[PDB]
Short mmCIF file of N, CA, C and O in Angstrom, two decimals:
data_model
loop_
_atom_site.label_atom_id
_atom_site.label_comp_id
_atom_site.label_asym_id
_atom_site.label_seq_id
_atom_site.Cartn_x
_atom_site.Cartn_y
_atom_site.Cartn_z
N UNK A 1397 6.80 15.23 -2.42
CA UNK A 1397 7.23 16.63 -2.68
C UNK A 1397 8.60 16.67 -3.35
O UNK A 1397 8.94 17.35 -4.31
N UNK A 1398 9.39 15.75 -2.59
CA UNK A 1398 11.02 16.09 -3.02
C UNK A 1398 11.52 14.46 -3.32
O UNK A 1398 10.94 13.51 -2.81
N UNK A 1399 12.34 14.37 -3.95
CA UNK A 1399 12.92 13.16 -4.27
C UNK A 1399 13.12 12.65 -5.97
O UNK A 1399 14.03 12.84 -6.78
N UNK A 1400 11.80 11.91 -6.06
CA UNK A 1400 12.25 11.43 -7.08
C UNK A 1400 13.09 10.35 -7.82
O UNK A 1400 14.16 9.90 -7.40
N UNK A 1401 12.53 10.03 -8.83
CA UNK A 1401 13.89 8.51 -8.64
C UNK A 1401 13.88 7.43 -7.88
O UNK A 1401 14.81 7.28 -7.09
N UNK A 1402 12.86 6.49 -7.93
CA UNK A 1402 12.63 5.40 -6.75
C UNK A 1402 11.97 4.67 -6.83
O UNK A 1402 10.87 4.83 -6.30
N UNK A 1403 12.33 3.37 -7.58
CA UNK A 1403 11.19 2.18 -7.33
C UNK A 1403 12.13 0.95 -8.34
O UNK A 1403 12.41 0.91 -9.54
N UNK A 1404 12.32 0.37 -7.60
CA UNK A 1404 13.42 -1.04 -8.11
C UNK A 1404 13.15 -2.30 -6.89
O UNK A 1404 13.62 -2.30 -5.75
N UNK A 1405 12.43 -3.13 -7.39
CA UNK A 1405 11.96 -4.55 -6.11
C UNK A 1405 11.15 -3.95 -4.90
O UNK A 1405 11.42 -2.96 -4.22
N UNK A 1406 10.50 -4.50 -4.85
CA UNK A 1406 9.74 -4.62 -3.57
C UNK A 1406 8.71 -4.05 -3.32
O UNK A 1406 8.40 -3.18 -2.51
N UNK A 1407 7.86 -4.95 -4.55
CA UNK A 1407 6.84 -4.71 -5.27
C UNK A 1407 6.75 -2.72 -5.10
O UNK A 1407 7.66 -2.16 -4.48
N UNK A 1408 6.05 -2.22 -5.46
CA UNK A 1408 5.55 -0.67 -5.63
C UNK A 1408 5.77 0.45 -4.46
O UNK A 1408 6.95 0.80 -4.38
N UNK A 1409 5.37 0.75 -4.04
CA UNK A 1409 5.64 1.35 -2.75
C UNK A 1409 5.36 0.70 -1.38
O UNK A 1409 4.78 1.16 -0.40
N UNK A 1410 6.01 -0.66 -1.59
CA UNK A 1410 5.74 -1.09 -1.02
C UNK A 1410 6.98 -0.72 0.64
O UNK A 1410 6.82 -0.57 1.85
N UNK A 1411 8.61 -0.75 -0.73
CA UNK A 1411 9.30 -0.21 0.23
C UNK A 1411 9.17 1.45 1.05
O UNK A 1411 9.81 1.86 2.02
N UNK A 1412 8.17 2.12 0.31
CA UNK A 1412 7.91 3.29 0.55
C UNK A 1412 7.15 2.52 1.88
O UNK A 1412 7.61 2.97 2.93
N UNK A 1413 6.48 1.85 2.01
CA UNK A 1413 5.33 1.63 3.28
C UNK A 1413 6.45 1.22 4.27
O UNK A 1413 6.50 1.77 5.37
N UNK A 1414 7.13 0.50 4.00
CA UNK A 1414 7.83 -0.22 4.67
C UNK A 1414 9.19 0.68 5.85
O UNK A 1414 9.73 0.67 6.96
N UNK A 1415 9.13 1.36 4.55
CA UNK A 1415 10.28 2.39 5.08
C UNK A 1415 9.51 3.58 5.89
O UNK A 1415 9.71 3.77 7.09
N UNK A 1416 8.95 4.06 5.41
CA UNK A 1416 7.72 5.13 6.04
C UNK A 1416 7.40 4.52 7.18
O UNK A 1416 6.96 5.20 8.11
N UNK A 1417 7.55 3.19 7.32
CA UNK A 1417 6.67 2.37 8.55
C UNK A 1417 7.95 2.18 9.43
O UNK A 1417 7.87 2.93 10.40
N UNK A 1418 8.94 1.55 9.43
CA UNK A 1418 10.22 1.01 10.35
C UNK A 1418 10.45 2.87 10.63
O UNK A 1418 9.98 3.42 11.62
N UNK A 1419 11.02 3.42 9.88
CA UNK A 1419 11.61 5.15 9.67
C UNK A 1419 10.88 5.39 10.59
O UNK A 1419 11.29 5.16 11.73
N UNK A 1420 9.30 6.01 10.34
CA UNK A 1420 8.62 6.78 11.52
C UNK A 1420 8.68 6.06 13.17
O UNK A 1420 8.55 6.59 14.27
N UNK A 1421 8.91 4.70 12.81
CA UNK A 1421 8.75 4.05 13.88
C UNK A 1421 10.35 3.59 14.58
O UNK A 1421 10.69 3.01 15.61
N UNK A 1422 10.95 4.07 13.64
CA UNK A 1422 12.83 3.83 14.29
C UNK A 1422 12.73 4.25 15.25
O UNK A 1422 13.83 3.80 15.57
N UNK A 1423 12.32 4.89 16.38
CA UNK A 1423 12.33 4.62 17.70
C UNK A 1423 12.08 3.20 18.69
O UNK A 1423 12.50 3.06 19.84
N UNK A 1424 11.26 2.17 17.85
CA UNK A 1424 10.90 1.12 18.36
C UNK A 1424 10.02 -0.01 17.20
O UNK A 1424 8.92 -0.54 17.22
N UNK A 1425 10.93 0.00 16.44
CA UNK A 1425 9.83 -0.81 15.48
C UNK A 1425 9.77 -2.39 15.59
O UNK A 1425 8.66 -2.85 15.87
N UNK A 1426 10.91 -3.37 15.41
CA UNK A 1426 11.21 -4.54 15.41
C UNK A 1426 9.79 -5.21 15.17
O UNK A 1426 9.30 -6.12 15.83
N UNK A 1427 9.26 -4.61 14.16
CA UNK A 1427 8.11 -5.59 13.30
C UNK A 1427 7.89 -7.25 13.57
O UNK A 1427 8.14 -8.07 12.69
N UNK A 1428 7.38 -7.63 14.91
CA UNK A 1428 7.02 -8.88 15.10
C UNK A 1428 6.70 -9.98 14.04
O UNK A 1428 6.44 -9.48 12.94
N UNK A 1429 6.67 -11.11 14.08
CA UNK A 1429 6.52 -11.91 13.40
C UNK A 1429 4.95 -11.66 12.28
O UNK A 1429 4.59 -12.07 11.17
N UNK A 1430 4.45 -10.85 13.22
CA UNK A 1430 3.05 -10.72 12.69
C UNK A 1430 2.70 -9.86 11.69
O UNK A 1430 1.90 -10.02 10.77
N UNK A 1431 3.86 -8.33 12.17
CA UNK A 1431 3.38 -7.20 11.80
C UNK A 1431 4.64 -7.85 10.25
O UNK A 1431 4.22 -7.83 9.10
N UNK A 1432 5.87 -8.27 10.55
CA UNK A 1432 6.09 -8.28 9.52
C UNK A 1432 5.13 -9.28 8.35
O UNK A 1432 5.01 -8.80 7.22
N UNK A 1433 4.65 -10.26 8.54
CA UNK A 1433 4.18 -10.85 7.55
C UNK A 1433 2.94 -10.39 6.91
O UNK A 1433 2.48 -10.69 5.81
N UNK A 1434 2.32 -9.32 8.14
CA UNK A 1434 1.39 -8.41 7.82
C UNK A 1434 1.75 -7.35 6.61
O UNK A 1434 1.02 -7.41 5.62
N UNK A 1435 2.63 -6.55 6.61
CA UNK A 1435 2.85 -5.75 5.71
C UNK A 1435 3.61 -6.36 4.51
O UNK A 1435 3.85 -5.62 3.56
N UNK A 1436 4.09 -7.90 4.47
CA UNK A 1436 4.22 -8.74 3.66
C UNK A 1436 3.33 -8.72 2.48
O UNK A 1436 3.26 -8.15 1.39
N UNK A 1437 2.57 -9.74 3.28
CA UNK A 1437 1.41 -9.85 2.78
C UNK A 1437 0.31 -9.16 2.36
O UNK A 1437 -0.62 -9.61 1.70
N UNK A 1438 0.45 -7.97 2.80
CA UNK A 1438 -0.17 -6.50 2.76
C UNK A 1438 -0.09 -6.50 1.43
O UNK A 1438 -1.06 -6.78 0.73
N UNK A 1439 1.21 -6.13 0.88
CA UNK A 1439 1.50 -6.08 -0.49
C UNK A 1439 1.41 -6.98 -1.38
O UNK A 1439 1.40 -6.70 -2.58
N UNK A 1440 1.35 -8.03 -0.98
CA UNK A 1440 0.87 -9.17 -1.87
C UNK A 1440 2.35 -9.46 -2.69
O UNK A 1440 2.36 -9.70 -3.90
N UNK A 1441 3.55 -9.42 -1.90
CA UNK A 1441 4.77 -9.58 -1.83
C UNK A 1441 5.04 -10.84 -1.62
O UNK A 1441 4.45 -11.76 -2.18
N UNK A 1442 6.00 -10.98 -0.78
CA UNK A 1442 6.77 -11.75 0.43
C UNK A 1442 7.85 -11.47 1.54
O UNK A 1442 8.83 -10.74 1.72
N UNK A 1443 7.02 -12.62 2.30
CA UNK A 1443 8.09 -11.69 3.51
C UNK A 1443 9.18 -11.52 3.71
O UNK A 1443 9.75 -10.66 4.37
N UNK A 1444 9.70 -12.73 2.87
CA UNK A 1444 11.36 -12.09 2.49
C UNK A 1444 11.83 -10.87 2.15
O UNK A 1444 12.91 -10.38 2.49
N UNK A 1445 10.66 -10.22 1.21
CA UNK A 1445 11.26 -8.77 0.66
C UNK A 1445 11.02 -7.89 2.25
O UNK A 1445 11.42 -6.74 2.41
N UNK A 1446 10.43 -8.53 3.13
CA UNK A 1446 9.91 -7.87 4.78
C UNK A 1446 10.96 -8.26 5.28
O UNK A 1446 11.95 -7.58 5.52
N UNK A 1447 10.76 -9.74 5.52
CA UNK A 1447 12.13 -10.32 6.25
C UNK A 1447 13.19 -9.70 6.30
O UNK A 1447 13.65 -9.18 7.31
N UNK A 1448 13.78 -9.70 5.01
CA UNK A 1448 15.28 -8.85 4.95
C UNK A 1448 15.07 -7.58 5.26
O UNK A 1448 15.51 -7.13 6.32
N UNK A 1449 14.30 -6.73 4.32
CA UNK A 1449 14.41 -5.31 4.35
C UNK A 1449 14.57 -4.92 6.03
O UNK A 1449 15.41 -4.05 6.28
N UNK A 1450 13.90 -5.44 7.08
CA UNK A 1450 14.20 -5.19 8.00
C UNK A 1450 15.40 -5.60 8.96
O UNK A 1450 15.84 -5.07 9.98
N UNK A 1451 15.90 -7.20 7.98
CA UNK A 1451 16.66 -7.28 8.55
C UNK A 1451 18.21 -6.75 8.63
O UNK A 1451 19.09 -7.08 9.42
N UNK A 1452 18.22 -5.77 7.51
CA UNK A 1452 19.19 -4.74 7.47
C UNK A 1452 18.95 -3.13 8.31
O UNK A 1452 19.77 -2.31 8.72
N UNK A 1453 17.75 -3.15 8.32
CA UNK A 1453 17.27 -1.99 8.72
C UNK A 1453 17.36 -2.30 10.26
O UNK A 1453 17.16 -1.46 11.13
N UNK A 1454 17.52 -2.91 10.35
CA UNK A 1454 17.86 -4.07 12.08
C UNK A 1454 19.24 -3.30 12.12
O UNK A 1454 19.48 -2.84 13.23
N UNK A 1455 19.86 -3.14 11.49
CA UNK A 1455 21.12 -3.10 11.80
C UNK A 1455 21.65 -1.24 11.89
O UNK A 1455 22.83 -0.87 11.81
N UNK A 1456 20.77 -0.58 12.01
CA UNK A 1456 20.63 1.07 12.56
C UNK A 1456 21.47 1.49 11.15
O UNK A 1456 22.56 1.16 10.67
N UNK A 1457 20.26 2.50 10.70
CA UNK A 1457 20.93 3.00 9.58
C UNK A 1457 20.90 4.36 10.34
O UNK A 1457 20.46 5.26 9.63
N UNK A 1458 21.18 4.65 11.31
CA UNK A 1458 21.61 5.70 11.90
C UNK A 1458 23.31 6.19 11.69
O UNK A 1458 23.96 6.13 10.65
N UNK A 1459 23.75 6.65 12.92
CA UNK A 1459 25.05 6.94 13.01
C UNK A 1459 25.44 5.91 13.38
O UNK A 1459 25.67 5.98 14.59
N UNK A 1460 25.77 4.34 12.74
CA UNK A 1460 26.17 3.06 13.15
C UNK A 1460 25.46 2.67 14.71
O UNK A 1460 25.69 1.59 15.25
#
């Protein structure tokens, strides 16, 4: 609906899944070894682009 402007690495929407996925789930996500290589591999990525992305997103993009 709103936005716009968005898509640089990690493969296609993939960060859209990714983010849509940790985001809705920022109450409790910490994507196991599984789930991350799952949505890795999902995309036909790597899990590095999983690995990391969460592993910043690890780090509360909340109010610190």
């Amino acid at each position: 609906s709103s936005g716009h402007i968005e898509g640089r690495h990690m493969n296609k929407q993939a960060t859209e899944i990714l983010n849509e996925y940790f985001y809705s789930h920022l109450s409790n996500p910490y994507p196991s070894e599984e789930a991350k290589e799952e949505l890795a591999k999902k995309c036909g990525i790597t899990v590095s682009q999983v690995s990391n992305w969460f592993g910043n997103k690890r780090i509360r993009y909340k109010k610190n």
